[PDB]
């Protein structure tokens, strides 16, 4: 159960980062990170897939209700690979990922605010920031985490967000999933060299997941070892 | 486990492509 919660994020992920690490500002604010970079990045055979990530909170006008909300330019595999359940609708095709449709995913709570009526979501349009957006899918949270006190959150194909309501080449991050059952330790340094190449400087700054995965795996199985062993010893004593 | 499937009745439709804009 707990591993399924953990492996729910698969194998693996190398989110791309600027600056130095998590706490950095200006060097992290600047991003020499073309989404085009992914091309050659996706070119490596061991990789199964790798995906762009970006997000922007913006004001959202609508009919009468008129409030800002966070939003998330992402892959269509997002709710898929996260396995996030849908309140309604689906994610989106890669074709329409290229289609730049004004399709979009929203919080159920966001609907709770927008829609006292509980009107059907699909086919409806609501502007984000400025651009009109024909809402379709909305997804229920797959975690409780009530202490998070989650606010309004929204999801877009990244091509649309970063594209036709941002236009920057530099997305917040890029997920990178390896194939082959390949080890987390290896190649991440090779990708590091890769960023030492396609960029001229030490700018990978990425975090990684079979490291923490394998170690918590050894941890849990170790707990199995202690528990089952002392149990069986006691029973043999019986 | 119910094999229940959401489904639709396809019909010779007419194209409604036009898009939108703020």
């Amino acid at each position: 159960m707990v591993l399924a919660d953990i492996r729910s994020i698969g194998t693996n992920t190398i989110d791309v980062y600027p600056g130095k690490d998590f706490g950095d500002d200006d060097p992290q604010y600047q991003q020499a990170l073309k989404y085009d970079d992914l091309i050659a990045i996706q070119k490596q055979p061991w990789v199964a897939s790798a995906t762009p990530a970006v997000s922007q909170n913006l004001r959202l006008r609508y009919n009468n209700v008129d409030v800002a909300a966070s939003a998330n330019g992402v892959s269509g595999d997002y709710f898929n690979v996260y396995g996030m359940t849908f309140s309604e609708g689906n994610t989106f095709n890669q074709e329409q990922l290229n289609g730049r449709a004004q399709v979009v995913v929203l919080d159920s709570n966001t609907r709770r605010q927008l829609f006292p009526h509980k009107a059907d979501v699909v086919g409806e349009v609501i502007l984000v920031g400025n651009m009109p957006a024909r809402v379709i899918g909305v997804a229920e949270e797959k975690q409780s985490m009530f202490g998070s006190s989650k606010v309004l959150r929204v999801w877009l194909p990244y091509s649309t967000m970063s594209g036709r309501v941002m236009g920057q080449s530099w997305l917040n991050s890029i997920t990178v999933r390896v194939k082959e059952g390949f080890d987390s330790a290896e190649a991440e340094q090779q990708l590091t060299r890769l960023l030492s190449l396609r960029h001229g400087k030490k700018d990978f700054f990425t975090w990684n997941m079979d490291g923490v995965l394998k170690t918590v795996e050894k941890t849990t199985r170790t707990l199995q070892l202690f528990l089952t062993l002392v149990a069986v010893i006691s029973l043999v004593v019986g | 486990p119910v094999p229940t499937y959401q489904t639709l009745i396809v019909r010779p439709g007419d194209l409604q492509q036009s898009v939108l804009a703020t």
Binding site: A101, Q102, R134 | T7
Partner: protein
Amino acid sequence: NILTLADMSAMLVKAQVSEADVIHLKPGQKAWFTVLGDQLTRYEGQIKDVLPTPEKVNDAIFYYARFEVPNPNGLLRLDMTAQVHIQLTDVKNVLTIPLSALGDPVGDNRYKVKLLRNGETREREVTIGARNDTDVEIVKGLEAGDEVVIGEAKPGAAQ
């Protein structure tokens, strides 16, 4: 600048279509729009033209377009937000597949599970050209009136 003036006998709209779609949009194509504040009160008219000079909001260039809506009763304040529907073509007598259940092998080939009269769902490869904001105009490989398991489809799966 002592004082500004404006004629409100008719209202012009600045419909900022994205640069990706500007290549289409032939003049005189019919279009309609509606304001956020009145929810449902459609206005409509001919498109007039396209402005030669773009202006941008950081990322992504946008091109304007204009109408010429009549303004009875003194409604529509200046710079009011207005959602705008511009019309592309209406080819007819042809099926379009909802995108909710599409299968797309190769990214060219396109399998699609559909329920049969037997109660057996079965997929078929199909070719499709035209694509829509919501669906895709299928051209071959599926009959009209066919049941189509839009939700949680799998091939060969009787229900």
